[PDB]
């Protein structure tokens, strides 16, 4: 429906973020379900964490390493409102498998606020944007994200080190209301490179699994943050890449086609 559609994009642009329901079919759920699954017992994963404990277990880069992990992150339908609310032609950076859980001694913690956008290592990190997709049900206990609407029309942060910093930084920022967002399974959420966002802790028994991807301007070039773990990038051959050269080819694919 286009006039729908048209909504839907008023909504992104004046709040930074959009959720949309339903955007997978349940067997689509299942199938994707099963592979974040196999990908998180069989492959290497990377603790996102501290002293306090993990804050997430993912999968970097999980679409190379599996053409079913590719197609979601290139899914129809995922693909053409991530175009339609960018405002252009997309590429796909990157796709990571994502788990919150419980184990015995390392407790689920909260996802703290902060900035996606110029911890992206190309050179449109400012207007990227961000496909979460849920594989289970998440309701608010389970980890769900909140996000401040508003908050991707705030001037950035101070530029200091640490390139996700500065939520909460700026004037009035903290008086600004945020919304905490649970989702079905299949159900996705777009946000905005500069939308602030955080999440909450697993504190169920369940694990919570999800997507995350992150689409590019399809014109977009390499732009080194400064973070090794950040700015190197596998599968793209074996010299570092240069600083203002394009990402292009299957590697980082086009949306449309
Ligand atoms: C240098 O900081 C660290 O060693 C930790 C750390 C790490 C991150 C981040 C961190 O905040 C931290 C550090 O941030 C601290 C900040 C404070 O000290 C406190 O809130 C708590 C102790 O966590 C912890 C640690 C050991 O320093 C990020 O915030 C982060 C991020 O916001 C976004 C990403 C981040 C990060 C972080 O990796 O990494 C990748 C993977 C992500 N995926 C899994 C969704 C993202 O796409 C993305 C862009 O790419
Ligand atoms: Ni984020």
Redesign the pocket.
Same mark, same amino acid.
């Given at each position: 429906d286009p006039a729908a559609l048209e909504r839907l994009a008023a909504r992104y642009r004046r709040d930074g973020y959009v959720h949309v329901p339903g955007v997978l079919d349940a067997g689509e759920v299942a199938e994707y379900l099963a592979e974040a699954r196999r990908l998180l017992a069989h492959e290497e994963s990377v603790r996102?964490?501290?002293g306090?404990g993990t804050?997430?277990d993912?999968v970097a880069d999980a679409q190379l390493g599996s053409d079913t992990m590719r197609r979601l992150a290139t899914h129809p339908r995922i693909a053409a409102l991530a175009e339609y609310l960018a405002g252009s032609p997309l590429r796909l950076f990157?796709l &990571?498998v994502?788990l919150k859980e419980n184990k015995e001694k390392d407790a689920s913690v909260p996802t703290?606020p902060?900035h996606?956008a110029f911890?992206?290592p190309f050179s449109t990190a400012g207007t990227a944007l961000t496909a979460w997709v849920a594989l289970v049900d998440v309701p608010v206990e389970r980890g769900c994200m909140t996000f401040v609407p508003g908050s991707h029309l705030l001037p950035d942060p101070d530029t200091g080190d &640490?390139p996700?910093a500065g939520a909460f930084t700026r004037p009035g920022e903290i008086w600004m209301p945020r919304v905490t967002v649970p989702l079905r399974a299949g159900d996705c959420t777009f946000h905005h490179a500069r939308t602030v966002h955080s999440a909450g802790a697993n504190s169920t028994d369940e694990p919570r699994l999800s997507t995350?991807a992150?689409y590019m301007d399809a014109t977009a070039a390499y732009r080194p943050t400064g973070?090794a773990?950040?700015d190197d990038l596998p599968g793209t051959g074996a010299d570092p890449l240069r600083e203002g050269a394009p990402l292009t080819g299957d590697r980082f694919p086009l949306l449309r086609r």
């Open positions: 996102w964490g501290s306090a804050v997430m993912y990157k &990571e994502l703290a902060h996606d911890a992206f &640490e996700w995350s992150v973070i773990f950040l």
